[PDB]
Each structure stands twice: as C-alpha cells, then as structure tokens.
Ligand binder design. Structure first.
Ligand SMILES: Nc1nc2c(ncn2[C@@H]2O[C@H](COP(=O)(O)OP(=O)(O)OP(=O)(O)O)[C@@H](O)[C@H]2O)c(=O)[nH]1
Ligand SMILES: [Mg+2]
Ligand SMILES: [Mg+2]
Ligand SMILES: [Zn+2]
Ligand SMILES: [Zn+2]
Lengths: 394, 40, 471, 86, 22, 147, 50, 133
C-alpha cells in the first residue's frame, strides 16, 4: 500500500512590518508574483490563491484595486500566452514582455525569440487565411491544458526547417513578412481576433441559479419533491415519473428554499398551485438567491482545484476541462473575476462576506435562512457523492 | 575527472617539466567547529 | 513468540559478522563438502528475476553479488558464506540467455544447468536447508517454470516462493493477490509459503520486506537443531553434514546427464515442441538431401539420424543428433566424472583399438612410405626444446585407484560395512542414509584430507616446486 | 559545491555559452573558476590543453592550435543571459 | 508543474546536435 | 576461511561495512480571527494533553457518526450473539485514514469549523488526509495561539 | 594476445595507439541534458515564489 | 556471393522516369532527371497511382502520421499516404535514437536496384531467341 512518512505544518501568522515601505514591497513581491504566475499557468486557481493568502493574513486582496490588477494581469497573461511567451518574468524587477533591445535594429522593439517568431507566423497565417476568406485553421485553438483537444499528435515550437508546418491551402508566412509587426499595440491591432477571448456567452452564467448535478431523486426531502410533482400534476402540464427529469433551476431553487426550513414547506403545501407556491416565496427568495449564489461560487472555487474544475464544468456546460480550449477557459475565468468584482462593489455586504472564512462568521454576516438553504444544497451534493462512494464500496 | 598519462607530445614535454614546480605552502591549523574560541 | 525471537536474534548476530565469496562450483565433485560444510540455502529461478540482486542485498554489498541487465551473468553455482555459519547459493537462470555472446554458448549453458539440477537433486536432504523459487512480479507462467516444478515434485523437494520486482506492482495489493492466485492455480497448493520482496543494494531505503528474508533463511537453517544450546550461535556453527555416498551420487548423474540440458533460445516453446521441431526439420532434410539418400537405414542408425535414451527433466527423449559435439567434449572434459575416466581408461577397448588401427598406417607397420629429406636430429632436438620449455607441452600421467578395494570389492577396505561398530545404543540402528549430520566437521574435519576438489591452489600437475616441465 | 557560478561549468544556453576559465579583477565582486590550488591545477590544465567537449558536438573553450593563457584574459565583467548577449 | 501555454521545448544539447545533423 | 578483511570489497564485506550499510528571530503569538476571545481563553486555559484528548474524542465521535451513516460499521461485532461493541476503538480510529475526498472534507468541515473554528489553506487541505495529520495541524495551531 | 604482442588486437592501421597525450578530461559538458544548466537560479525565475 | 545480378536489363520492360511525376506524401510535381532529389521505388507495375513505381522526395519519404523515419526503410501505403509499420500496426509512437525526420535511403532507385525485374522477364522471351523464327 501507500503510506506517507510525515508531513510538516506551518502556523498562519501575519507578517509584521516596522515601516510602510517594507509592507508595500512585501505585498507587491509576494502577492503580485503569485497572482501573475497563477494567471499565466492556471488562471482558474486565482480564487484558491486569494483564499490561501487571506488565511495567511492578506487583508487587501478583495479590494477593487487588487481585483482590477488581477483582471489586467489575466488579460495580459492571455496576451502573452498567445504571443508565445513561456515565463512571465524575465527578472524579479521587470516582466519578460517589456524587454526592448537597444543599439540594435530598433530601440523599442520587443526582444523576440524563435518560438515567438513561429507563433507570430501561425498568427499571420491565420490572418492571411481570414483575409483570403477561406477557413482559417489556427493551430493553437485546438490546444488545451492536457495538450491538443482532438489530435493525439505531438507538436513543439520552435519548428525546424526539416519538418515545417504544411498548409493544404498554400498560404505562406515569413519572418521577413512579420518584421514590421514589432510593438505591442501594432501586433494587437493585427491579431486581436485571436488573442482576445469571447466573454459574451458567460455574462449571465454566474448570476443564474445552478445545482451541482442535483436532480429530483437526490432531493433530500422526498415529501417536498412529491408535493412539487403533485402541484405540477394539478397544473395542466404532464409530469415525468422517472427520477431523471428535467426541472428548471429557477424552480429547483424554490424547491430547495422550501426543503431547507420545514415551516415554509408546510405553509406552502396547503396552497392550490405551484404558481402560488413560488409566488409566496418570491419576496423572500429575491433577497437570498443573489447571496446564496455568491457564497456558492466563492466557496466551491476557493477550497480545492478539483472543485474549481467541477464548478466550471457544471456552470459552463463543458464536457471536459482538459479538453476545452484555453481561449474559452480564459474567457470564463475573466467573467468569474468580473462577477467577483461586481459582488464586492455593487453590494456592501460582499466584501465582509468574502473576507469571512469560517462557518460562524459566514452565519453572522449571512441571513440564517440563506445559510440554511446553502448548507442544505451542499449537503445534498455531499450525500449524493457519499451514496456513490457507498455503491463503489459495496 | 582529469587523468594523467605519458604523452610523447609537446604538451607532455611541457607538463613533465611544469609539474615539478613547488606550490606555495602554508601551515593551516586545525579548525575548532565544536569549541568555537571567540564564542567564549 | 519464544522460538521466533531466538531465531531473530540469531539471524542478526550471524549476518552482522560479515560475509565473503567462498567458491564457484561447475562440476559435481568440487563441492563445499568438507571443512566448509555449512547449511546451504539456494535461490533458483528464470534468468533476470533478481536472484543475484537479492544475494547482493542480503550481503549488503552491490559489487559482491554481480548483477546486470544482460541475461546469463551467473553461469555456475556461487557459494556465499555469511557469518561463517551459512551458505547462500546463487544459481544460474534456467532459460534463454539473450544478449550474452560468450563463446561455446551451448557447452557453457549445458554445464550451467547440469551442475544446477544435479546439485539440487543430490543435496536436497542436506545441507541444502531451503530452496527459494524466485519468480518475476508480473511475468506469467512459462514452460520453464513448468519444468522447474516437475523437477521439484519428482525429487520431492520443499521450496519457498519469492516474488521479486515488488516495485512493479507499486503498492497494488489487488494485483499481487491475483499474481499469487495464478501461482496457486499453477502449483495447486494454498499452503505454499510466498514472500514478496524487492532488493536494491545501491540504496537501502528502496528495499522493502528484505530484513524478513534473512530471518526466514535462518529459520529453515536451524530447524535441524533440537536443543536451545544448539539454537545458540555456537550450536549453529557446530552443525555440519556428511558427504554423499557413491551409490546416490552415481544414480543422480545417470538420470540427469549433461547432454539432456539443452533448452531453446526462447522461453515459450516447451521441450516437447523443441524436440518435435528438430524431428520435423531433420526428416525434411533427409528426404531432400541427395547424399542422405545415398546412405542406408543401418548407416543412418550409426549416424544417429533416423533414430541409452536421454530423458530430460520433463521426461521427454532427446535424439543423439540434437546433442552438438561441443557438449560431448564438455562431459568428457569434466574432471572427476565417469566420462573423463572412461576417456582415460578406454570407453570401448575392442572398438577403440580397431578404430585406431584403421585410422593409422597399421598395427605392425613402421617407417612406411606412402604409395625430400627427413627431419634432422639437430632439428628434432630444437623442436623438442621449443615444445617442452616454450609451448609447455607435456605428456599425460596415470590415474590412481584404491588397491584394497580394486582387488576385492566385498571386503572392509572397500567400505559398505553392514555391521554396527557401536554397541549399547538404540538410535544408531534407526539413523541411516547417504548423508547424515556430523557436529563439528568445520573445525575437526574427516582426518587427513578434508577439502574437496578444486579447493587448494597448486595441486597435481600445477605444482610450484619443480616447475612446469617436471610435472 | 564550487565558488564560481555554474554556467562556467555548463552554460545556461543549450549550445554551452559561457564555458571556460574566467579571470576576475582583485577588487571585483564576481568570482571565477581560475584557481591555482594544487586541487584546481588539474582541471585548469585540462581546460587549457584538452579543452571541453560539449554534448552538442563542439569544443567550447579550446578546439585546437594555440592554447589560451588564462593569466592574461581580460577581467570578467558580468554574466550571460538568454534575452541579450551579455 | 501545470502550465497552459504554447508547446515549447527547451534548447537542449541533444536538440542542437539534431539541428546540426540536419 | 572467512577472511573478509583480507579479501577485497569485490570478494567480501566486513562486519563494520555490513553494520554501517543499514545505518548510513522574534515570535509573536497570533490567534485566528475566526474564534472569539472567550473561546480562545477556554481552549488555551483548559490544557495541552486535555486538548489532545478533546480533539481525539470529538474526531472519533464525528467520524463514527459519519461511517455509521454511510453504512460501513467500524464497531467490533462478536459472532456468538451478533452484538455491538461498547465504544469505538482509539487504535482503530488512529489507524483509520481519510482517503476519500468526500468523507475527509465532510469530517474536516464538521470538526474543524464546528468545535475548532479553524480554516486550512489549500496545501493543508491536501495534506490533511490522515487523523494524525489533523491532530498535528490543530496542535500546531493551538501552540501558535498560546501566548 | 592477438595480432601483435605489445599492441594486441589494436591494429596499426586502425586508430591511434595512445589517445592520451598529457592529460584528458573524461567529463563531458552538459552530460545531464538539463533544460536549464545555468544553475538553480539564473536569468528568469522558475515557478512562483514561496 | 551477393546472389543478385548487376546492371538490370530493361529490354523487356524499360523503366524510365515519366514526364509527369508527383509525390506520394505530397502529391506535388518532382524534378524528372535534372536532380535526383526524388526516391524512385520501381516494381514493374502499372497499378495506380504513379505506374512503373511511385516517387518520394528525400525529405518526405518519412511517415505521414507520426512524421518520423522508417525502421527498415519500408513504408506502408495507407489510403494514398505512406505510413510506417509501427503506425500501420497500431503501436505507440516510438522516437528513434538516430535521425528523426529523414530516413536512410538512396536516390534514384539506387537502393531498390538490386531487387526487382531482371532479364529474362518471362519464359516465352527466351524461346523467342533460341528459336530461328
Ligand atoms: N525494479 C527492479 N529491478 C530489479 C529487481 N531485481 C533485479 N532487478 C533488475 O534486473 C536485472 C537482473 O538482475 P540479476 O540479479 O542479474 O538477476 P539474475 O537472476 O541474477 O540474472 P542471471 O544471473 O542472468 O540469472 C538487474 O540488473 C536489476 O537491474 C527488483 O527487485 N526490482
Ligand atoms: Mg545472477
Ligand atoms: Mg588538442
Ligand atoms: Zn513528397
Ligand atoms: Zn508513423
């Protein structure tokens, strides 16, 4: 079997500083470097990073300035990744994307490598195909975290002259052709369509109610699901007797709000129709759905990386997070950052809720009913997973 | 690492005479790692 | 446990004193029997399963137990004396040796297997205390493993199983359970002891379940002891065994000839399929070769082409055409054997005389001329000096025999006295056998000559007293 | 370990850039691999006479001909880098 | 580590040797 | 016969080699802002050994409730009358490892935020897969909380 | 000994008799084929700090 | 000792470079006789495509799937493309220790010259000579 020998543990203690400049330099170095490396390698784990640093004693993480820096570094990290940069930092003082050679060909031209030149060759080939009108086959759109999305092949940059890239349409690119494209804005105005993601389809994803693969069978209150089915049958609409039925998330939100506290369930069961059952919950549900969704999107993403993967899959409809392309991944991460910014800014209660890390403090800052609903939902998820584990064991 | 053999070339002819030089000598005393004197 | 704690402290005390390489054995006569008669433990198995690696890890020296990726690193019995009280026997791998391009491969491999199986069959009663069948981690059962089990169940030798390459499972208890389940299905016994252990003499931390093996081999080496005083370190060092008798050593060499140990290059074809492919290909060659049709069926019997019978381990017969002449010269070259004695004293006096008479000029013909000038005496004198003192060419000498037994085999000078010299005892009449237990032979010996053959240096013709040409 | 940086042993570049005996100024803060101890004389003589064979298939410090004189090399002034030349 | 970026092989002496061979 | 010191390292090893083959700032107390001053006073005034016993008993009860809700009985059941044991076994609790992510996150959310009011980082959540590691983590935390 | 007595199987027409004139360095530069042989820290930082 | 003829006689069926000639991995035209940069593999067959032997570029005689050299200088035609035996049999991609993106092969059928069609081709061609008619 596998057995670890021993693991060390370090106590969480906030760093003390005698003067202000020391604290400024420390927070800059530590937090900025960690955030940039995260946004470069795996920008999804920014929430885990923020949670860990707040646990270690970083108070100013959930501020508007830090969140703006985070989204800016995420956008620039996507830009660098599309350029073909491997390491975000050339030195501890300056970034790698801000290195200009002097006394050479140009004094402000970014210092390019052969890998960056080949990536610009790919970009220019895609742009020339787009201009000719035929289907532009950008090679790195099928590139993901685990590797290529569909092709089990292996590719590596820079490509040599013995095994170069072949184009069935005959479009050719050359370093002599890319030579004028040397500055950041000049290459952005040309290859913007391939470096920038698309965040439009996600504008209403994080603000919409969702459940972690929860269905009517996994509802903890059999009486609640049966009374919901009886109301839907009293209404002139057909019902599905099978456990795997498609129920709307807005309706399942009210179902969980009912099943959380039994008083409201008994008060709503005597009503005539599910229409009235949702109407009587509408006033209290509006002031709690936003809060419970915010709490869920922060908790399920600040604890473990696998939970972040599952959350992103469930909310974006992705089949596999290792198979989905990196552009839409970056788009979803940026939209999640914008959602966190909205929660922190537009709502005054969001910043203390984000700073709170324990159940006691989250109950103190959150409505008791909303916390009960959220705990019931997450406990239903945990019960489903535990039943799956029991079926595995048996 | 670097091995020494006969040669029969000019490099070996030079080494046979250069390796006879007496290197600078200095009597270094035994260190005191356990009983640090200037610590007392 | 009372006995388990005592054997544990004993194994630690013996192994902590160091070890060395005692003697390599290639012929059945040159065995450690004598002043070096320790209780032995052997490790047999297919090539490249970790036999020498386990030995080197038990001996705590990577360079002592030679191990390598290429098969055929060990081609003879390597006796390792641990703490001057036990012997660990490293055996050659039974199977195809790939990548080893040593000359006389067939003869060297046949000699390697001959000494292996004849040693196991002979000294199974002692001092070979335990046999350990080393098998690979995930390698399935092969016909070579079948040949090993058939040999063991016919000789009735108890053996333990050691599953090496334990790192291949990577902590998969389920795969290990299915591996031992496949072993129990092939063996047919649930009670057979199996110990899984890997061996890395380079780094001690990589080893797992390795300290339990030295405790196990000490357990089987001390099971002959009866008293607790014998269980002590002094009692184990005093434990020694007697040499085999002529009757039992002759029987095992007759049933297991050197020519029978011919294995295929691969490890998938059994001996039956290997000998059938020889028969099929030889029959086609005879029916296709024109000069083969020029011979008669009686001449083919003389040329052992169309055709006592040599039986292998499995019991299948091998034709004489399958045995190459290099193996025949090997068996006749092995000192202290019947074949070497038959070559010296004449295998067939009537047949060899007529053969030599026909191949030469004649039995009574001298200084004949077939149907220049002869070599001068000054040349023959110079040629004799260059042969004797430069080329070191010498003449053969005679072989000696016991006179008291050669004159009359049924007297007391020959041995095999059925009488009981000791009077007043009741246990001597029950205790019998070719090999018995004698206490203290390592320090007392038989009396006079105690070492076996090929033990001392500069013996016989290789004396350093008078030089080479004097012999 | 060694006092001199590890790029003098194996340069940071894949080609082996920055291999050889580097002399430093007495008042400088950088440290080089030119040492005259009885233990360092073997490797110094090796670099001067035999050279250094790189796994890429080229001799970095001394291919052949006139051997370099590390006692008269200009003093070391920095370290290599992948972005710029030096 | 886990890095989401373009496939980039480090400049290895073996790679330099292969390029020189070509 | 048995001359390891005379023979070389290629022919034998000595007892010595055989034996040695096997052988060879300022601190400031910080309390987590999760719990209250009275709770910190109680948990730092009770004891150290008693706090370890408290950890052990509470974690035992929590994981036993969890495993009995799951259905894997950790109680010793005799085969004469099919009864249940009196109390959980501390040795079995210590030997009980938390390999399943679901059960481990459930028990840590139940006992760590319940009666300890602590919150581990990502690496600590990764490492806290054993009851021994949980005990070590909470012990380090209460030691840091101590004045 | 094969072929010649002093030279053995080493034929005069094949190769050089003694290929060690003076000293020879058995070491080969960058024999490990590491991606970054400049040291533990050199040039760009590798991985996030702490 | 070699047991194969030299200077294979093509009087029965001449093997000449066609005027139009494309590649198998590339389907692009090649040089006819001015440069031997192509690889000719003749077998005396009009079987499509590229009768009396197909053609390959030196650089492109490699496998088309894994883009690697050939093991024993033997390629596998797969729906118009040339694959390697490990690629055709379905085994995993094995990176060779030697040259990667080019294989050991001679130019202008020099490597495939010692085997193929020789003189005489058929049996009825010898009796044409030994008969007076
Ligand atoms: N991973 C692993 N490799 C092993 C283990 N044991 C042996 N090997 C490897 O297998 C090779 C064969 O080891 P040997 O000790 O020569 O096996 P052998 O049975 O003595 O070989 P022969 O003398 O030819 O019969 C060695 O070079 C080791 O590298 C093991 O326990 N685990
Ligand atoms: Mg061996
Ligand atoms: Mg030179
Ligand atoms: Zn081509
Ligand atoms: Zn292929």
């Amino acid at each position: 079997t596998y057995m670890p020998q021993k693991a060390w543990f370090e106590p969480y203690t906030p760093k003390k500083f005698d003067m202000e400049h020391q604290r400024i330099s420390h927070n800059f170095y530590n937090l900025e470097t960690k955030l940039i490396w995260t946004a470069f390698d795996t920008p999804e784990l920014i929430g885990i990073l923020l949670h860990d640093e707040t646990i270690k004693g970083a108070p100013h993480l959930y501020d508007a300035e830090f969140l703006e820096s985070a989204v800016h570094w995420t956008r620039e990290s996507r830009y660098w990744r599309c350029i073909g940069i491997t390491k975000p930092f050339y030195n501890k003082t300056t970034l790698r994307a801000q290195c200009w050679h002097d006394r050479g060909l140009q004094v402000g031209t970014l210092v390019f490598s052969q890998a960056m030149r080949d990536a610009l060759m790919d970009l220019e080939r895609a742009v020339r195909r787009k201009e000719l009108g035929l289907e532009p086959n950008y090679v790195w759109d099928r590139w993901g975290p685990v590797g290529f999305i569909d092709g089990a092949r292996t590719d590596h940059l820079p490509r040599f002259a013995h095994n170069p890239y072949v184009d069935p349409d005959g479009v050719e690119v050359t370093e002599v052709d890319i030579a004028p494209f040397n500055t950041h804005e000049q290459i952005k105005e040309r290859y913007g369509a391939f470096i920038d993601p698309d965040l439009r389809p996600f504008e209403g994803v994080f603000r919409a109610p969702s459940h972690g693969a929860l269905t009517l069978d996994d509802v903890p209150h059999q009486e609640a699901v049966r009374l919901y089915r009886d109301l839907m049958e009293k209404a002139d609409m057909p019902v599905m007797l099978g456990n795997g039925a498609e129920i709307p998330p807005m309706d399942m939100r009210a179902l969980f709000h009912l099943s959380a506290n039994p008083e409201r369930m008994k008060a709503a069961s005597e009503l005539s129709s599910w229409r009235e059952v949702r109407g009587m919950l509408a006033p209290v549900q509006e002031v709690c759905d936003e809060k419970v969704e915010a709490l869920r999107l922060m908790e399920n993403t600040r604890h473990d990386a696998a939970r972040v993967r599952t959350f992103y899959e469930e909310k974006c409809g992705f089949s596999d997070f290792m198979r989905t392309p990196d552009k839409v991944i970056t788009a979803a991460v940026l939209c999640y950052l914008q959602e966190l910014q909205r929660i922190c800014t537009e709502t005054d209660w969001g910043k203390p809720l984000a700073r709170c890390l324990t159940d006691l403090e989250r109950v103190n800052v959150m409505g008791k009913d909303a916390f009960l609903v959220y705990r019931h939902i997450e406990d239903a998820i945990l019960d489903k997973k535990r039943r799956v584990w029991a079926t595995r064991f048996a | 690492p670097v091995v020494f053999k006969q040669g029969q070339g000019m490099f070996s002819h030079q080494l046979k005479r250069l390796l006879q030089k007496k290197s600078i000598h200095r009597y270094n005393w035994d260190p005191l790692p356990m009983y640090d004197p200037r610590k007392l | 446990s009372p006995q388990d704690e005592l054997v544990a402290k004993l194994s630690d005390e013996v192994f902590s004193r160091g070890n060395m390489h005692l003697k390599n054995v290639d012929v059945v006569s040159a065995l450690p029997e004598g002043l070096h008669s320790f209780p032995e433990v052997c490790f047999i198995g297919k090539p490249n399963v970790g036999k020498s690696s386990i030995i080197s890890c038990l001996l705590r020296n990577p360079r002592l137990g030679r191990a390598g990726r290429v098969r055929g690193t060990t081609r003879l019995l390597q006796f390792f004396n641990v703490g001057d009280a036990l012997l660990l026997v490293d055996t050659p791998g039974y199977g195809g040796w790939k990548g080893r391009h040593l000359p006389q491969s067939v003869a060297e491999r046949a000699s390697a297997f001959a000494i292996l199986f004849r040693y196991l069959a002979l000294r199974s009663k002692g001092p070979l205390k335990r046999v350990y069948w080393v098998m690979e981690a995930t390698k399935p059962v092969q016909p070579r493993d079948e040949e090993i089990f058939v040999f063991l169940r016919n000789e009735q030798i108890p053996f333990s199983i050691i599953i090496s390459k334990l790192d291949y499972f990577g902590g998969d208890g389920a795969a290990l359970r299915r591996q031992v389940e496949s072993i129990y299905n092939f063996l047919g016994t649930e009670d057979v002891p199996v110990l899984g252990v890997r061996a890395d003499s380079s780094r001690p931390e990589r080893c797992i379940n390795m300290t339990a093996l030295q405790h196990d081999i000490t357990h089987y080496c001390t099971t002959d002891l009866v008293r607790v005083e014998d269980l002590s370190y002094s009692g184990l060092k005093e434990l020694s065994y007697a040499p085999p008798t002529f009757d039992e050593v002759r029987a095992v060499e007759e049933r297991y000839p050197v020519e029978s140990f011919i294995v295929p290059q691969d490890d998938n074809l059994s001996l039956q399929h290997f000998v059938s492919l020889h028969q099929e290909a030889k029959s086609r060659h005879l029916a296709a070769s024109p000069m083969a049709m020029r011979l008669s069926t009686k001449e083919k019997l003389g040329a052992n082409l169309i055709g006592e019978t040599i039986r292998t381990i499995n019991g299948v017969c091998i034709p004489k055409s399958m045995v190459p002449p290099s193996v025949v010269q090997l068996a006749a070259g092995q000192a202290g054997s019947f074949a070497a004695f038959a070559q010296h004293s004449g295998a067939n006096a009537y047949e060899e005389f007529l053969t030599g008479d026909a191949t030469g000029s004649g039995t009574f013909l001298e200084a004949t001329g077939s149907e220049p000038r002869e070599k001068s005496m000054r040349r023959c004198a110079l040629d004799k000096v260059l042969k004797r003192y430069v080329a070191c060419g010498r003449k053969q000498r005679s072989l000696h025999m016991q006179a008291e037994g050669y004159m009359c085999p049924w007297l007391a000078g020959a041995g095999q006295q059925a009488r009981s010299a000791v009077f007043g005892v009741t246990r001597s009449r029950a205790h019998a056998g070719g090999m018995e237990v004698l206490k203290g032979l390592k320090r007392t010996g038989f009396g006079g000559q105690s070492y076996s053959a090929r033990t001392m240096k500069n013996r016989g013709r290789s004396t350093k007293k008078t030089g080479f040409w004097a012999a | 370990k060694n006092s001199w940086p590890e790029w003098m042993d194996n340069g940071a570049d894949g080609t082996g850039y920055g291999i050889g005996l580097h002399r430093t100024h007495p008042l400088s803060r950088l440290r080089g691999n030119l040492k005259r101890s009885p233990s360092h004389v073997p490797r110094v003589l090796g670099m001067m006479i035999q050279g250094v064979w790189h796994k890429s298939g080229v001799k970095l410090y001394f291919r052949g001909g006139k051997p370099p004189n590390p006692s008269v090399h200009p003093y070391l002034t920095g370290e290599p880098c992948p972005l710029y030349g030096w | 580590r886990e890095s989401r970026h373009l496939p980039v092989l480090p400049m290895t002496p073996r790679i330099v040797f292969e390029h020189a061979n070509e | 016969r048995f001359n390891p010191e005379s023979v070389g390292l290629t022919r034998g090893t000595s007892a010595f080699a055989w034996k040695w083959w096997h052988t060879q700032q300022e601190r400031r107390s910080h309390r987590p802002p999760a719990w209250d001053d009275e709770f910190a006073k109680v948990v730092l005034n009770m004891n150290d050994a008693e706090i370890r016993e408290y950890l052990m008993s509470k974690l035992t009860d929590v994981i036993f409730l969890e495993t009995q809700r799951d259905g894997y009985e950790l109680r010793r059941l005799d085969f004469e009358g099919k009864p249940l044991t009196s109390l959980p076994e501390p040795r079995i609790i210590e030997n009980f490892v938390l390999e399943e992510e679901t059960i481990r996150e459930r028990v840590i959310y139940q006992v760590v935020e319940g009666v300890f009011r602590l919150s581990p980082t990502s690496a600590d959540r990764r490492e806290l897969r054993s009851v021994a590691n949980i005990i070590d983590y909470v012990l380090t935390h209460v030691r840091a909380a101590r004045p | 000994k094969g072929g010649r007595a002093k030279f053995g199987t080493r034929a005069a027409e094949s190769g050089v008799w003694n290929d060690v004139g003076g000293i020879t360095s058995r070491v080969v530069a960058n024999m490990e084929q590491n991606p970054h042989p400049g040291g533990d820290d050199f040039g760009p930082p590798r991985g996030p700090p702490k | 000792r070699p047991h194969f003829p030299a200077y294979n006689e093509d009087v029965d069926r001449p093997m000449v470079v066609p005027p139009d000639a494309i590649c198998f991995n590339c389907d692009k035209p090649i040089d006819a006789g001015d440069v031997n940069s192509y690889v000719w593999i003749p077998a005396g067959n009009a079987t499509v495509p590229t009768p009396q032997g197909y053609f390959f570029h030196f650089g492109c005689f490699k496998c088309n799937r894994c883009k690697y050299r050939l093991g024993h200088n033997k390629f596998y035609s797969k729906d118009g493309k040339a694959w390697c035996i490990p690629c055709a049999l379905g085994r995993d991609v094995r990176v060779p220790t030697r040259r990667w993106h080019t294989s050991y092969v001679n130019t202008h059928r020099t490597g495939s010259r010692l085997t193929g069609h020789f003189f005489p081709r058929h049996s009825h061609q010898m009796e044409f000579l030994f008969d007076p008619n």
